[PDB]
């Protein structure tokens, strides 16, 4: 029916979770994500760089193709996450896609609200182009909030005349800051991963929640490059993804959406103990490579 590992992981996550309602202070949520992050695989090579005034790492699995690069935008509700929280998952995407990842430590809210993260994303992309990477050798990817930022970065880039990269992969994207979608009710019980509305509040700091660079589900997608959208069936953000796919299709974008049954928010991040995490990462890699061969 459902795999044994997901059933197991669902139980561990329900057990470890803080109870519904209780307010976890920000720097406490921040530290907890750091402290619990998976260590990247031993064969992942890392190089610290500065990119548009942000800390970054080049994240190079074995097998990287010369000339290829992923701008990777991490999750964390726009308020948390770092190079550290995501080095592990991004190592595996680099493995699968045989491409080095640029892992950006973009400005986080509330210290730096919207559109700070979009400016960092766009500049990061401009930096890659400036470094000599060709549009057709580039891909943009990210998870959760980062996966919304993927879209925002594209839209914003398109608007400023930048060429589109060959592909983009939003993973469990948060692309609608209103958080009104049916799936917050429909998929609530199945999702072990209020809390989210606070992050939107902190990121927006008063801005219009239907701003296209905050909620790319209200943006004009015309001209974006081909998309692979990943989302699990068992997450409150199911609707962001279904609606992002229909938007893209309507705006004439080549969109492939895959709902993975039984899966949770960014199940990729649990690749060390979830076969489906590895499987979905492999597939992100295959899709990036497919798009580079075309």
In the set 57, 92, 119, 235, the catalytic residue is: 235
3-state secondary structure of 138: strand
In the set 144, 172, 215, 241, the catalytic residue is: 144
3-state secondary structure of 289: helix
Cα separation, 109 vs 117, in Å, equals 8
- Tell me, yes or no, if 235 is annotated catalytic: yes
What Å distances lie between residue 111 and 29, 104, 114, 136, CA to CA?
15, 17, 10, 35
Closest CA to 219 of 191, 247, 193, 197: 247
Instruction: Give ∠ CA 112-114-120 in degrees, rounded to 5.
Output: 75
Cβ neighbors of 92 (< 8 A, separation 6 or more) are 41, 61, 268, 271, 278, 281
- Tell me, yes or no, if 265 is annotated catalytic: yes
3-state secondary structure of 165: coil
- Tell me, yes or no, if 88 is annotated catalytic: no
DSSP 8-state assignment for residue 215: -
Cα separation, 150 vs 222, in Å, equals 15
In the set 74, 86, 230, 265, the catalytic residue is: 265
Per-position DSSP letters for 56-85, written without gaps between them: EEEEE-TT--TT-EEEEE--STTTS--HHH
Active site amino acids: 144, 235, 265
């Amino acid at each position: 029916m459902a795999g044994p590992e997901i059933v197991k992981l669902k139980k561990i996550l329900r057990e470890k979770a803080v109870p519904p309602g209780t307010e976890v202070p920000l720097d406490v949520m921040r530290k907890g994500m750091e402290k619990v992050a998976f260590k990247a695989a031993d064969d992942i090579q890392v190089e610290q760089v500065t990119v548009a005034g942000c800390a970054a790492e080049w994240v190079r699995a074995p097998g990287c193709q010369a000339g290829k690069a992923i701008l990777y935008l991490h999750g964390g509700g726009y308020v948390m996450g770092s190079i550290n929280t995501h080095r592990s998952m991004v190592g595996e995407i680099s493995r699968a896609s045989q491409a080095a990842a640029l892992l950006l430590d973009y400005r986080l809210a509330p210290e730096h609200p919207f559109p700070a993260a979009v400016e960092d994303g766009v500049a990061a992309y401009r930096w890659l182009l400036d470094q000599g990477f060709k549009p057709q050798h580039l891909s943009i990817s990210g998870d959760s909030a980062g996966g919304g930022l993927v879209l925002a970065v594209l839209v914003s880039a398109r608007d400023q005349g930048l060429p589109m990269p060959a592909s983009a992969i939003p993973i469990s994207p948060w692309a609608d800051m209103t958080c009104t979608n049916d799936s917050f009710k429909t998929r609530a019980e199945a999702d072990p991963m209020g809390g989210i509305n606070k992050m939107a509040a902190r990121y927006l700091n008063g801005a219009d929640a239907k701003h296209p660079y905050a909620s790319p589900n209200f943006a004009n997608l015309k001209g974006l490059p081909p998309l692979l959208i990943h989302v699990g069936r068992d997450e409150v953000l199911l609707d962001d993804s279904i609606k992002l796919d229909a938007k893209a299709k309507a705006d004439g974008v080549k969109s492939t959406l895959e709902i993975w049954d039984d899966m949770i928010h960014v199940w990729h991040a649990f690749h060390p103990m979830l076969p489906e995490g590895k499987q979905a990462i492999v597939r992100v890699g295959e899709f990036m490579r497919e798009q580079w061969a075309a």
